[PDB]
Amino acid sequence: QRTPKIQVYSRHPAENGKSNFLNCYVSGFHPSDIEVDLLKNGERIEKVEHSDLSFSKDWSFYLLYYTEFTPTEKDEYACRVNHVTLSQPKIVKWDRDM
Amino acid sequence: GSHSMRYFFTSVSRPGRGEPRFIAVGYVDDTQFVRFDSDAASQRMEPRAPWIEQEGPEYWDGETRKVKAHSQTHRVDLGTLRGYYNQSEAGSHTVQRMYGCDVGSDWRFLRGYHQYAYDGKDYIALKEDLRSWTAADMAAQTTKHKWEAAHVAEQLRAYLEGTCVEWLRRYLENGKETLQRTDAPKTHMTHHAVSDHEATLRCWALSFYPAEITLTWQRDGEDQTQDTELVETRPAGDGTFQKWAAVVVPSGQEQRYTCHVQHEGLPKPLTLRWE
Amino acid sequence: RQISQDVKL
Ligand code: NA
Numbered sequence A: 001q002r003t004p005k006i007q008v009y010s011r012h013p014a015e016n017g018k019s020n021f022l023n024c025y026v027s028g029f030h031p032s033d034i035e036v037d038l039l040k041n042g043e044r045i046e047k048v049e050h051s052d053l054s055f056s057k058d059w060s061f062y063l064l065y066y067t068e069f070t071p072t073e074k075d076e077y078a079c080r081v082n083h084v085t086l087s088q089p090k091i092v093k094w095d096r097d098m
Numbered sequence B: 001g002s003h004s005m006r007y008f009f010t011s012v013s014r015p016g017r018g019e020p021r022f023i024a025v026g027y028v029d030d031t032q033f034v035r036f037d038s039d040a041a042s043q044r045m046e047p048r049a050p051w052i053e054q055e056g057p058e059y060w061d062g063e064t065r066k067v068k069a070h071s072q073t074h075r076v077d078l079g080t081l082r083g084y085y086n087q088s089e090a091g092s093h094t095v096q097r098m099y100g101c102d103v104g105s106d107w108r109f110l111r112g113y114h115q116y117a118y119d120g121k122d123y124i125a126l127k128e129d130l131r132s133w134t135a136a137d138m139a140a141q142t143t144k145h146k147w148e149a150a151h152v153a154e155q156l157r158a159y160l161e162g163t164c165v166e167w168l169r170r171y172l173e174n175g176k177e178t179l180q181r182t183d184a185p186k187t188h189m190t191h192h193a194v195s196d197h198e199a200t201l202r203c204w205a206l207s208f209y210p211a212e213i214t215l216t217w218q219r220d221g222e223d224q225t226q227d228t229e230l231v232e233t234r235p236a237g238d239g240t241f242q243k244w245a246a247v248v249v250p251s252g253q254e255q256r257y258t259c260h261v262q263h264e265g266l267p268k269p270l271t272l273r274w275e
Numbered sequence C: 001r002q003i004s005q006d007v008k009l
Helices: B057-084 B138-149 B152-161 B163-174
Strands: A005-010 A020-029 A035-040 A061-069 A077-082 A090-093 B003-012 B021-028 B031-037 B094-103 B109-118 B121-126 B133-135 B186-193 B198-208 B214-219 B228-230 B241-250 B257-262 B270-273
Touching (some): A005 A077, A005 A090, A035 A061, B021 B057, B021 B163, B031 B057, B057 B094, B094 B152, B094 B163, B109 B152, B121 B138, B138 B152, B152 B163, B186 B270, B198 B214, B214 B241
Antiparallel strands (some): A005 A020, A020 A061, A035 A077, A077 A090, B003 B021, B003 B094, B021 B031, B186 B198, B198 B241, B214 B257, B228 B241, B257 B270
């Protein structure tokens, strides 16, 4: 069992009030069953899509979850991930500089 | 510059009810072009890139037929390996398979692949000579004995050196507008004070294709590595990729540091300097 | 284009 790496970021440089895409990229995990939610101020976003499951050279899996969003000064975004390797759901906050 | 075609297959047993979850995807380079998902309603190989849509009904019927047969074999394989490894019917297990070919800078065959993992570990893999097998353990060894007796490698070698390379080249031509377009990284540097004394320089590479790239920091023209940070290359979600590398420097000394960017889309490496 | 041969472990 390998725990997921997590990156949370936007498709395009973040500009307040301009529409964009929020990404949560989970990789390096085994097995493949995984729960991934994107959050807006602590609440689950409903219209979230993901890529088709594939894996890297070392057989570990990767997925991209994504949704359209419009960043603002105040709103917080985050990616919540649960996997068999995790005691509790791991939350990673979106930092526009990362 | 080289190119690849790859097919990736994942089969996850569902011991509580029904058949394994099965997902297949095909790539040319870093571009996914087909998918099959056992949980989807179509039960067909589906297009995932515009340029494969040019292919006719017979292609889709043939690719559906082959991928479905493959899914049934993985179902059998899960049962076989559970037997080999003396495991109960109660737990869920994973078979993974990848196969494909590269063409080199001369546009001819360069390498062929065909390998499996069980529960995330190497099981059996075709060697580079496309004649011999690497069996990780005694379960994989029994598979190897069978395959050697059945001349499985010869039949794979013919596909890898023939059909695989030929169709890869076909796709590359039909999809050339994107598949043979290199998107050089869009690069910039940002600057973040950590204290009155030190600051983070972050060198960004955005919107590039293909995914392969190198970002390197230097101080006074020498590789740095110390006090750096480099995120794993990540998908933008529009088919391109992103990466950044950062260095912490003494404030006032930013000018000493250069970020070096290498990518197939760049005739010469790029140098970025905060100044 | 997928391989035709139907190999089992
Ligand atoms: Na089940």
